[PDB]
A paper describes a structure:
CPS secretion is mediated by an ABC transporter containing KpsT and KpsM as its nucleotide-binding domain (NBD) and transmembrane domain, respectively. The transporter partners with the periplasmic and inner-membrane-anchored KpsE subunit, a class-3 polysaccharide co-polymerase (PCP), as well as with KpsD, which is assumed to form an outer-membrane pore. The KpsMT transporter is surrounded by a cage of eight KpsE subunits extending about 80 Å into the periplasm. Cryo-electron microscopy analyses of the KpsMT–KpsE complex in six different states reveal a KpsE-encaged ABC transporter, rigid-body conformational rearrangements of KpsMT during ATP hydrolysis and recognition of a glycolipid inside a membrane-exposed electropositive canyon.
To determine how KpsMT recognizes the glycolipid, the purified KpsMT–KpsE complex was preincubated with the isolated glycolipid before cryo grid preparation. Cryo-EM analyses of this sample provided additional cryo-EM maps similar in overall architecture to the Apo 1 state, but with poorly defined KpsT subunits. However, in contrast to all other structures, we identified two states of a lipid molecule bound inside the canyon (referred to as state-1 and state-2). Therefore, we modelled the putative ligand as a phosphatidylglycerol-linked Kdo monosaccharide, with the caveat that the Kdo conformation and its interactions are not precisely resolved. In state-1, with the putative Kdo sugar closer to the cytosolic water–lipid interface, the sugar moiety is sandwiched between TM1 and TM5 of opposing KpsM protomers. Although the exact position of the Kdo moiety is speculative, it is surrounded on one side by Trp45 of TM1 and, through the opposite face of the sugar ring, Gln181, Ile185 and Ile188 of TM helix 5 of the second KpsM protomer. The following phosphate group is near Arg94 of TM2. One lipid acyl chain snakes through the hydrophobic segment of the canyon, where it is surrounded by Phe85 and Phe86 of TM2, as well as by Leu191, Tyr194 and Phe195 of TM5 of the same protomer. The second acyl chain points away from the KpsM subunits and does not mediate extensive protein interactions.
Author numbering:
A (entry chain D): 14 to 269
B (entry chain A): 1 to 226
C (entry chain G): 9 to 50, 72 to 144
D (entry chain G): 340 to 371
E (entry chain C): 12 to 269
F (entry chain F): 340 to 370
G (entry chain H): 340 to 369
H (entry chain E): 340 to 367
């Protein structure tokens, strides 16, 4: 048996286990992951519909919200769920074909599959309501989505490796995932904030990725200066390098 | 004096209310050693801890004028992040003793335990023998009218059991025991009268031999059901 | 510290005091509201001026000289809380008047309602 | 407003009596 | 001696306060550094973000004291919620001595947080006086009354959450996540006067906004308050929450022992 | 304001007495 | 509007029933 | 302001002492 085949086997089994425990005993989690974008959209439109109409009179608010929200939901899930994978299977590390990175990859693939299903369903009901739901340049959208996915998975693995001890710090990162929602262009277009606050917001790679995904989605969408893809690409590459290094070095102490 | 009135104890289960105790009324004899023995899981331990006051009875109450110790070997009783010394300090501060007396108690328990370097170490890293040792030493520290043992004698190595028995026979005469053990020789060696708790009721026997004989008879009756 | 003492000293006594005050001892107070605005003849500063001047002291001197406020507000002797005790200080009289006359501002319209 | 004040006061002292009675029972729970 | 229940209550509260201070401040007292570091960091970030905006908003009050007076009470409230809610699992093994009822853990954590934030508040006013700002309240006992109302509301909410989420150890994270927008909306960083009126009544549903505004008003001289802000609404919220929390604790008193 | 200042003084002197009693109790227990 | 107020009365009656049942359970356990 | 400067210098010097003593004790 090749190492690749046993890797597929262990990933399949771990995916089955983690999909069973991610949703409820009678699949109550699927309702929550379908309803959370709905509640977010309801609150956001009912709070800023006229303001966003005044912002630019060319893009409807719900499609803008979906395109900026579903990738952020996937990124937040990848960051916040990948790091609990170590403590969920402490007792499972006794069968000599199971490694922590297998749990990491299983959780990541599930997060990706679930959010992709949610994205497809959301685009379907958005087109069903008479909105705009076809990306003009879908290949660049796929590229930016892949960059965002790799950045999120790398950060999740990095936080899983570093915070194997001190679980209080785990909680902390979830708190820091709340302001990241309110800054990275998810709610309101970034053309309305006063310009001197701009570069302090431009070190956030998720802002750049959201802006480029929206630009590749809509026809004739305007981006600001310094919203290059090179900065998120380099951030993701460096984060993945450091995460893999730290997992390799601190490998043996992730035992039972 | 020990009196029990209208005791009712249960816990909710998915298959209904598994009732353990229901309206128990009984008076215990004084100045004699009690061997409390019954069917395993039929209510021995809950009776012990309601006697120890850990769980107050939902209905009825117990009335006493003597001091009854908490179950010895209470390793889970002490909190993990504190050291053995800090747990001891907390325990004597619970009972509101004086400063110098409680200093005497912590010196006594550190002399008994003989742990040394790990005595000022938090107890999440402790092994079972060390926590059992400090539990035994702390329980022997307080002067109490009655003591509760949940079969904590036979555990441990030979030397710890030896000094445990030594300080125990130092405590007999001025104090009395309640034994909850599965070794019959302990009840024939350290008990005067024997109670038997079966199916939610307790029966007294002034003869220890009669009590253990009724125990084997009840076991044979349980094994005789087809 | 039985339950009877707690019920007597926390529920029955204060309700009894409030009942024997608000039923047989309290004095009725009639309100007379009005709604005004000041305009230039062919305005937020003038309505601030009016809002300050209504609670002023010189207006109280003029009104006490005119309509005899002090001896009117001392008439109800049954109620001891809302009546104006005779021989009180000028500052207490000013605070009593400020409590009695209530002025609210509608900033959307700049309308002064005086009750 | 006599009746509104009386009802508000009745609710307030009812809640206060309930809270202090629960506190009294809670401290009385200790029976060493 | 018979040792009346008030005496043993004092004894277990005193001992449990020692036990809980030994871990809240951390071993070797490393936590006090973060305890007085957090308001400093908050003050610095908010002042270099919004100093000119606050100066243009209301010039009668300088920014740091307006920040402190709404920051430290909210820090006390947040401590009295989050620290208090997890008071059950941290001492679950301690419930075996018959004088260790969980309400003692709740009260010990509440008094520890109260004392710590009181010393932090006194140090903050001392520093503000040392830097030449305005640091003496004009109506001190009214400020004490509003602070007491806020304290008892926070303690009641903490006890209610600790009672409710016992079988469910989760939803504590959701409590903290919901506590963050409470920081961002209660007007503890910027004056609430600049909020557009169409959002105003909904924001009045939050009692912490009322308590913060009432504590600020009794502190500064000539600080206006908005219409619809009163003491009766947060006082009633606090009283009802305290009654509900005590009643829920009385129902499930036996279930908080394992 | 005589009685008002007396009342606030009572409140503050009490609060600091409680806090310092707690801190002297824990510093007595520690050493 | 006959049907509109009936729903509000149903909701408030259910709320009052729930809270009164809970306090009655409290005073029964006492 | 001589007394003011002496007092704020004293406070900072004590703080510095506190932090360096705490780290030099906790490194052990
Ligand atoms: C001011 C900025 C925005 C306003 C937020 C206001 C905070 C809400 C109020 C507090 C809500 C709340 O629940 O508290 C939170 C505090 O908010 C944060 O996380 C700050 C986030 C920083 C990242 C932001 C990046 C932005 C992203 C841009 C790209 C957790 O902290 P906590 O005080 O509750 O933790 C105490 C625990 O009991 C024990 O943890 C320790 C301890 O004492 O052993 C250990 C460890 O040192 C650390 O976890 C902890 C401490 O020291 C480290 O700050 O203390």
């Amino acid at each position: 048996r090749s190492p690749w085949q046993i890797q597929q086997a262990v990933l399949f089994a771990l995916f089955l286990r983690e999909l069973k425990t991610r949703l409820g005993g009678r699949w109550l989690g699927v309702f929550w992951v379908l309803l959370e974008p709905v509640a977010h959209i309801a609150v956001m439109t009912t709070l800023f519909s006229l303001a966003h109409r005044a912002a630019m009179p060319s893009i409807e608010y719900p499609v803008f919200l979906i395109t900026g929200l579903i990738p952020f939901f996937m990124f937040r899930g990848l960051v916040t769920r990948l790091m609990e994978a170590i403590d969920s299977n402490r007792g499972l590390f006794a069968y000599r074909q199971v490694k922590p990175i297998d749990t990491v990859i299983a959780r990541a693939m599930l997060e990706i599959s679930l959010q992709s299903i949610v994205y497809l369903i959301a685009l379907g009901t958005l087109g069903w309501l008479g909105f705009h739901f076809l990306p003009v340049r879908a290949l660049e959208l796929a590229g930016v989505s892949a960059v965002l996915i790799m950045l999120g998975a790398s950060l999740g693995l990095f936080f899983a490796v570093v915070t194997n001890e001190i679980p209080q710090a785990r909680a902390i990162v979830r708190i820091s995932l709340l302001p990241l929602y309110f800054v990275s262009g998810v709610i309101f277009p970034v053309h309305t904030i006063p310009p001197q606050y701009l570069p302090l917001l431009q070190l956030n790679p998720v802002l750049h990725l959201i802006e480029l995904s929206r630009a590749s989605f809509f026809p004739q969408y305007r981006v600001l200066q310094g919203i290059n893809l090179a900065y998120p690409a380099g951030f993701a590459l460096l984060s993945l390098f450091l995460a893999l290094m730290l997992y390799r070095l601190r490998r043996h102490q992730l035992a039972s | 004096m020990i009196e029990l009135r209208n005791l009712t104890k249960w816990y909710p289960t998915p298959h209904g209310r598994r009732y353990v105790f229901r309206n128990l009324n009984f008076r215990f004899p004084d100045d004699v050693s009690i061997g409390l023995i019954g069917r395993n899981g039929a209510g021995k331990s809950t009776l012990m801890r309601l006697l120890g006051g850990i769980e107050a009875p939902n209905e009825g109450e117990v009335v006493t004028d003597v001091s009854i110790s908490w179950p010895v070997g209470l390793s889970g009783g002490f909190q993990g992040s504190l050291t053995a010394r800090e747990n001891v300090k907390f325990v004597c501060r619970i009972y509101g003793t004086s400063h110098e007396d409680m200093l005497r108690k912590v010196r006594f328990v550190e002399e008994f335990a003989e742990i040394g370097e790990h005595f000022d170490l938090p107890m999440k890293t402790y092994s079972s023998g060390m926590r059992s040792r400090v539990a035994f030493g702390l329980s022997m520290a307080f002067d109490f009218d009655y003591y509760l043992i949940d079969e904590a004698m036979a555990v441990g190595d030979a030397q710890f059991r030896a000094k445990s028995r030594a300080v125990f026979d130092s405590r007999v005469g001025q104090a009395n025991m309640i034994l909850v053990s599965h070794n019959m020789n302990d009840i024939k060696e350290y008990c005067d009268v024997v109670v038997l708790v079966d199916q939610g009721q307790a029966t007294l026997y002034e003869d220890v031999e009669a009590g253990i004989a009724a125990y084997q008879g009840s076991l044979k009756k349980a094994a005789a059901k087809p | 510290l039985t339950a009877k003492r707690l019920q007597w000293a926390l529920v029955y006594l204060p309700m009894l005091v409030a009942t024997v005050y608000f039923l047989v001892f309290s004095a009725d107070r009639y309100v007379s509201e009005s709604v005004i605005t000041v305009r230039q003849t062919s305005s937020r500063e003038d309505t601030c001026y009016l809002q300050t001047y209504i609670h002023s002291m010189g207006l109280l001197q003029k009104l006490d000289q005119q309509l005899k406020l002090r001896e009117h507000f001392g008439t109800p002797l049954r109620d001891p809380l809302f009546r104006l005790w005779g021989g009180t200080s000028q500052e207490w009289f000013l605070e009593y008047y400020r409590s009695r006359v209530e002025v609210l501002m509608d900033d959307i319209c700049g309308l002064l309602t005086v009750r | 407003r006599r009746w509104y004040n009386l009802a508000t006061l009745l609710v307030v002292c009812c809640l206060i009596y309930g809270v202090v009675s629960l506190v009294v029972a809670t401290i009385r729970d200790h029976q060493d």
